[PDB]
Amino acid sequence: IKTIMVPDWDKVDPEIIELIKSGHMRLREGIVYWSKGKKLDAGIVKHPFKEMTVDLSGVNVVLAKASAVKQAGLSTGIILGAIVIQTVYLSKKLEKIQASIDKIAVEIQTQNQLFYLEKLSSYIGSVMAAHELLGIYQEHDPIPEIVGPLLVTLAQQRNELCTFLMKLIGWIEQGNEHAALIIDFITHVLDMMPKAIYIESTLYTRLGHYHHADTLVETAGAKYTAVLQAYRGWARDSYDNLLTGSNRLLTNKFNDIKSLLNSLENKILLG
Amino acid sequence: TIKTIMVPDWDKVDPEIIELIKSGHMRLREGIVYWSKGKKLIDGAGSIVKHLPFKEMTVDLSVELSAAVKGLSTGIILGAIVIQTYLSKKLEKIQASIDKIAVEIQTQNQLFYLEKLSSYIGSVMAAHELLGIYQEHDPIPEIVGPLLVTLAQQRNELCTFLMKLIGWQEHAALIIDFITHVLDMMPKAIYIESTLYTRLGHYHHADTLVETAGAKYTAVLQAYRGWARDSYDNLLHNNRLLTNKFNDIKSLLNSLENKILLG
Amino acid sequence: TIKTIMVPDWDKVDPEIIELIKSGHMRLREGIVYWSKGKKLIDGAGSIVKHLPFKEMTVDLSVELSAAVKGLSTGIILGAIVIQTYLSKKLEKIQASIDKIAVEIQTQNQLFYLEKLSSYIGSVMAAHELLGIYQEHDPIPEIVGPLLVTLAQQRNELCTFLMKLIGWQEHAALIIDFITHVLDMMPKAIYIESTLYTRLGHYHHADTLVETAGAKYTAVLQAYRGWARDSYDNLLHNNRLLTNKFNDIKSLLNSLENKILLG
Ligand SMILES: [Zn+2]
């Protein structure tokens, strides 16, 4: 049971709504702006919010489609993004990932851990700090000298994680149920990443760089999708060898892989 | 042992400013008076109201308990001591205990949390250095900004590390002393973080960050309390040592110093 | 005959602003509240404090004497009437009397003073126009500045002209009526000049200019008084006309309206 802030369209000028419908204006996190090449002489259009209640109980967060009285994917993505940015929904998943790290660190070979769990923990810390910074917010006082370096670190760590994440499947043959642990960990990290991308886009929007935010979502989502496709290929080539001569738990984890590949939540978050 | 700090000299402050502070229209942090959120009466863009005049004050560092005899002034002097002197000794002692703790948590294979903690020390120290330079010189946002990002990141990861420590004889005494002192350090570092925000002219950011970071610190503190309440009897020579450690825990749980620092 | 003016709506003003006005820290002119000279309490560069909220008020123009029943408010409403309505009629009547006065002063061979007076009318009118445009729109310094120079120049030369007129039957009645009405016009034009200064953000300039220009006006007025005291008996059908003219002189000499307009 949480209370978020959603755009109050009854207080929005109808011409703004019509220009949004025609594709001349776009929206990200309660801020309207001109679409690329659609401005009608430099520069932001307009920022009104009202309360909405959502019950965060393993609840399907996409709780949004039900909330359905006016103009569908647009408002659905609006409420999804509000849930991601304002609630503790992502904090619980980050703490779960840290718990998985804690458990995996004692179930591997010390020479095979190397430095990857450290990088994952650092990235989780950066995402937590970014969500916290999103929590402190003064609309009439931007903080570019802080949001800038934060976006830097977030971009570096996300790009690096994209390059070394699938490598971690090797930990299946490097134990000290184990394969299920590793697969679950990788799936949850991948499921978290689009939320972090959406946080990066929100931070870009807070600085007034809306087109930057759109393009960043596109390119980061492209790299993330490439990693997902590598994950899919590995699952296709390892399903039989893992479920024969090595039962219910691993099958549930492979089903979780398939659900990650068809995540409507991550599709909405990534445009 | 005798130190000299700068404190607001209210005899050089116009009484109308004092009054608007007492009416809640204005707030104060580390020598800066500013308008409260949504309480600005004049027409303008910023929120700064006044840079306070400073007088010298002698303190004896040999802390929450002599001055302020003429809640607000207590917090002012406490923050002045935290900023201008006290935390460096705590950080030195924390750094000194890192190796023996590494020995005791080696089987968890997450020693990098002790590296980052050390980095956190550096960061806090660097921050404490900047404020010193900023006692007579202008704050530089290209320097304060990245340091604030690093401080936030490392503070969040340190909270996760303390949670993992709680989740994991004399081994217990060593780890309990470590956890207690690291937790005790955190509110001062939060205060330093917020003072950097203030030096950048973001006073509302500073107040709200104290709120949020203190809530996270309080969540960790309550986890520590829950652990200490369910483990005191199953752990009792060394009995007196563990009893002193649990008394230190209870002192941290009711720390007036940290409650003042966290608002 | 019924006119509507904008007056400060004090029910929409924070009481602390009102209080700082009453303590002398802040002053007011035509909808603008600003810090008094050397009384600014906050840290800043400008002197602006507040743009007052405005309410509608009906007056009947058919003036210093109904409203303000809830010295300061009297001056506020008087200035609002001078700015937003009243002076135009006075200027029209002055312009209408210029030709007959030219006939009566032709032997002095300084009729250009009547040309400049006419220009002064234009200038004042143009100024009155700008303020109207400036009720909803931003003042433009490249427009207000040169007009202020012209207003100052023409006001000084008009004072010299009035002195020369004083230095120079029914001829007397005509010239006395002219002098009395021109002098009566001057304080309103001074007020308009100062309001232009206010619209440019130069409030202290406006107050000091009212002071200096009013001192010059008062010097001319006292010359007029000295002339009227030494000429009333040597000038007395037309006797009633001259008596009415001298009564108008005495009314101008004790004009509460002009004393309020000139501070
Ligand atoms: Zn390392």
In a mutational test of the C interface, the residue from B34, B41, B50 whose CB has the highest number of chain C CBs within 10 Å is B41
**A62 contacts A51 by C-beta, under 8 angstroms:** no
Q: CB distance B108–A105 less than 8 Å?
A: yes
Spatial distance between the Cα atoms of A23 and A34, rounded to a whole number of angstroms: 9
Chains that touch A (3 or more CB pairs under 8 A): B
Number of helices (H) and strands (E) in chain C: give both, helices first.
Answer: 10, 5
Side-chain half-sphere CA neighbours of C92 within 13 A: 4
Spatial distance between the Cα atoms of B132 and B209, rounded to a whole number of angstroms: 22
- Helices B170-199 and B98-105 cross at an angle (nearest 10°) of 120
Side-chain half-sphere CA neighbours of C135 within 13 A: 12
Spatial distance between the Cα atoms of B253 and B218, rounded to a whole number of angstroms: 9
Inter-CA distances, A236 with A165, A180, A239, A253, C22, Å: 17, 15, 6, 13, 82
Which tokens is B245 given? 């450690």
**Is the minimum CB–CB distance between C17 and chain B shorter than 8 Å?**
yes
- Residue in the structure block whose two tokens are 């390119």: A219
In a mutational test of the B interface, the residue from A146, A151, A157, A174 whose CB has the highest number of chain B CBs within 10 Å is A146
Q: How far is ligand 1, taken at its centre, from the CA of residue A125, in Å?
A: 15
Q: CB distance B156–A118 less than 8 Å?
A: no
Q: How far is ligand 1, taken at its centre, from the CA of residue B113, in Å?
A: 9
**Is the minimum CB–CB distance between A126 and chain B shorter than 8 Å?**
yes
The full 3-state SS of C26-93, as one line of letters, equals: EEEECCEEEECCCCCCCCCCCCEEEECCEEEEEEECCCCCCCCCCCHHHHHHHHHHHHHCCHHHHHHH
Side-chain half-sphere CA neighbours of B127 within 13 A: 33
Indicate contact of A with B: 3+ CB pairs under 8 A. yes
Which tokens is A98 given? 């840290």
End-to-end, the C-alpha distance of chain A in Å comes to: 27
Spatial distance between the Cα atoms of C27 and C35, rounded to a whole number of angstroms: 6
Spatial distance between the Cα atoms of C196 and C130, rounded to a whole number of angstroms: 9
Three-state SS for A34?
Answer: strand
**A128 contacts A90 by C-beta, under 8 angstroms:** no
Q: CB distance A117–B107 less than 8 Å?
A: no
Q: Which of residues 43-82 of B touch A (CB under 8 A)?
A: 47
Spatial distance between the Cα atoms of C201 and C188, rounded to a whole number of angstroms: 20
**A98 contacts B160 by C-beta, under 8 angstroms:** yes
Residues, chain A: 271
Backbone angles phi, psi at C109, to 5 degrees: 60, 35
Other CB atoms within a 10 A radius of the CB of residue A159 amount to: 11
**Which residues face B4 on adjacent strands?**
B58
**Is the minimum CB–CB distance between A207 and chain B shorter than 8 Å?**
no
Spatial distance between the Cα atoms of A105 and A168, rounded to a whole number of angstroms: 13
Which tokens is B30 given? 């580390």
Task: DSSP letter for A53, please.
Answer: E
Spatial distance between the Cα atoms of B156 and A90, rounded to a whole number of angstroms: 14
- Residue in the structure block whose two tokens are 């405005």: C54
Cβ-based neighbours of A262, under 8 Å, separated by 6 or more: none
**Is the minimum CB–CB distance between B230 and chain C shorter than 8 Å?**
no
Spatial distance between the Cα atoms of B84 and C58, rounded to a whole number of angstroms: 62
**B194 contacts B209 by C-beta, under 8 angstroms:** yes
Contact list, B167 vs chain A (CB under 8 Å): 102
User: Which DSSP helix (H) or strand (E) runs through A81?
Assistant: helix A73-86
Q: What is the DSSP string of B36-70?
A: PTT---SS-S--EEEEPPEEEEEEE----------
Q: What is the DSSP string of A214-268?
A: HHHHHHHHHHHHHHHHHHHHHHHHHHHHHSS---HHHHHHHHHHHHHHT-HHHHH
Contact list, C17 vs chain B (CB under 8 Å): 41
Side-chain half-sphere CA neighbours of A195 within 13 A: 30
Chains that touch B (3 or more CB pairs under 8 A): A, C
Spatial distance between the Cα atoms of A87 and C167, rounded to a whole number of angstroms: 86
Report, in angstroms and rounded to the nearest whole number, the Rg of chain C calculated over CA atoms. 20
Task: DSSP letter for A165, please.
Answer: T
Report, in angstroms and rounded to the nearest whole number, the Rg of chain A calculated over CA atoms. 20
Resolution of the experimental structure, in angstroms: 2.4
Spatial distance between the Cα atoms of A21 and A24, rounded to a whole number of angstroms: 8
Name the E strands within chain C.
2-8, 26-29, 32-35, 48-51, 54-60
Number of helices (H) and strands (E) in chain B: give both, helices first.
Answer: 10, 5
Q: Cα dihedral sign for B101, B106, B107, B109?
A: positive
Contact list, B47 vs chain A (CB under 8 Å): 141
In a mutational test of the B interface, the residue from C20, C42, C52 whose CB has the highest number of chain B CBs within 10 Å is C42
Cβ-based neighbours of A224, under 8 Å, separated by 6 or more: A162, A190, A193, A194, A197, A270
Other CB atoms within a 10 A radius of the CB of residue A34 amount to: 17
Spatial distance between the Cα atoms of B252 and B235, rounded to a whole number of angstroms: 20
Q: How far is ligand 1, taken at its centre, from the CA of residue A112, in Å?
A: 15
The alpha carbon of B207 is separated from its chain's Cα centroid by a whole number of angstroms, namely: 13
Q: How far is ligand 1, taken at its centre, from the CA of residue A119, in Å?
A: 8
Contact list, B148 vs chain A (CB under 8 Å): 146
Which tokens is C90 given? 């006075």
Inter-CA distances, A140 with A11, A203, B47, C56, C167, Å: 20, 15, 10, 32, 64
Q: Which of residues 92-121 of C touch B (CB under 8 A)?
A: none
**B76 contacts B117 by C-beta, under 8 angstroms:** no
Name the E strands within chain B.
2-8, 26-29, 32-35, 48-51, 54-60
**C190 contacts C261 by C-beta, under 8 angstroms:** yes
Q: How far is ligand 1, taken at its centre, from the CA of residue A121, in Å?
A: 11
**A136 contacts B205 by C-beta, under 8 angstroms:** yes
Cβ-based neighbours of B207, under 8 Å, separated by 6 or more: B27, B29, B37, B194, B263
- Residue in the structure block whose two tokens are 């991948």: A190
Three-state SS for C9?
Answer: coil
Which of A144, A129, A134, A140 has its CA nearest to residue A209? A144
Which of A88, A259, A244, A119 has its CA nearest to residue A183? A259
Spatial distance between the Cα atoms of B150 and A203, rounded to a whole number of angstroms: 17
**Is the minimum CB–CB distance between B13 and chain C shorter than 8 Å?**
no
**B9 contacts B25 by C-beta, under 8 angstroms:** no
Spatial distance between the Cα atoms of B225 and B253, rounded to a whole number of angstroms: 7
Dihedral in degrees, nearest 10, Cα atoms A173, A178, A184, A185: -70
With vertex at residue B228, the alpha carbon angle to CA B224 and CA B231, rounded to the nearest 5 degrees, is 135
Spatial distance between the Cα atoms of B99 and A156, rounded to a whole number of angstroms: 30
User: Which DSSP helix (H) or strand (E) runs through A7?
Assistant: strand A2-7
Write the single-letter amino acid at B246.
Answer: F
Counting Cβ atoms within 10 Å, is residue A245 exposed (0-12), middle (13-18) or buried (19+)? exposed
Which of B241, B223, B242 has its CA nearest to residue B232? B242
Side-chain half-sphere CA neighbours of B83 within 13 A: 27
Spatial distance between the Cα atoms of B251 and A22, rounded to a whole number of angstroms: 63
Spatial distance between the Cα atoms of C12 and C199, rounded to a whole number of angstroms: 22
Q: Strand pairing of A2-7 and B32-35?
A: unpaired
Strand order in the sheet with B26-29: B26-29, B32-35, B48-51
Q: Strand pairing of B32-35 and B48-51?
A: antiparallel
Q: How far is ligand 1, taken at its centre, from the CA of residue A115, in Å?
A: 7
Three-state SS for A8?
Answer: coil
Q: How far is ligand 1, taken at its centre, from the CA of residue A114, in Å?
A: 9
Name the E strands within chain A.
2-7, 25-27, 32-34, 49-54
Spatial distance between the Cα atoms of A79 and A62, rounded to a whole number of angstroms: 8
The alpha carbon of A162 is separated from its chain's Cα centroid by a whole number of angstroms, namely: 14
User: Which DSSP helix (H) or strand (E) runs through A6?
Assistant: strand A2-7
Q: How far is ligand 1, taken at its centre, from the CA of residue B116, in Å?
A: 8
Which tokens is A243 given? 């479920």
Residue of B nearest to A135 (CA): B212
Which tokens is C76 given? 């506020």
**Is the minimum CB–CB distance between B209 and chain A shorter than 8 Å?**
yes
For A146, the closest of B110, B148, B213 (CB atoms) is B148
Report, in angstroms and rounded to the nearest whole number, the Rg of chain B calculated over CA atoms. 20
Spatial distance between the Cα atoms of A203 and C134, rounded to a whole number of angstroms: 40
Spatial distance between the Cα atoms of B252 and B205, rounded to a whole number of angstroms: 27
Spatial distance between the Cα atoms of B149 and A24, rounded to a whole number of angstroms: 36
Spatial distance between the Cα atoms of C14 and C8, rounded to a whole number of angstroms: 12
For B202, the closest of A102, A125, A141 (CB atoms) is A141
The alpha carbon of B86 is separated from its chain's Cα centroid by a whole number of angstroms, namely: 11
Q: How far is ligand 1, taken at its centre, from the CA of residue A145, in Å?
A: 27
Three-state SS for A184?
Answer: helix
CB pairs under 8 A, 24+ apart, for C232-241? C235/C172, C238/C169, C238/C170, C238/C173, C241/C170, C241/C173
**Is the minimum CB–CB distance between B205 and chain A shorter than 8 Å?**
yes
**Is the minimum CB–CB distance between B204 and chain A shorter than 8 Å?**
yes
Dihedral in degrees, nearest 10, Cα atoms B217, B222, B228, B231: -120
Task: DSSP letter for A35, please.
Answer: P
**A198 contacts A269 by C-beta, under 8 angstroms:** yes
Q: Which stretches of chain C are DSSP H helices? A: 15-22, 72-84, 87-96, 98-105, 112-133, 141-167, 170-199, 203-229, 238-253, 256-261
With vertex at residue C262, the alpha carbon angle to CA C256 and CA C263, rounded to the nearest 5 degrees, is 90
Residues, chain B: 263
Spatial distance between the Cα atoms of B81 and B69, rounded to a whole number of angstroms: 17
C31-45 burial: b if 16+ Cβ within 10 Å, else e: bbbbbbeeebbbeee
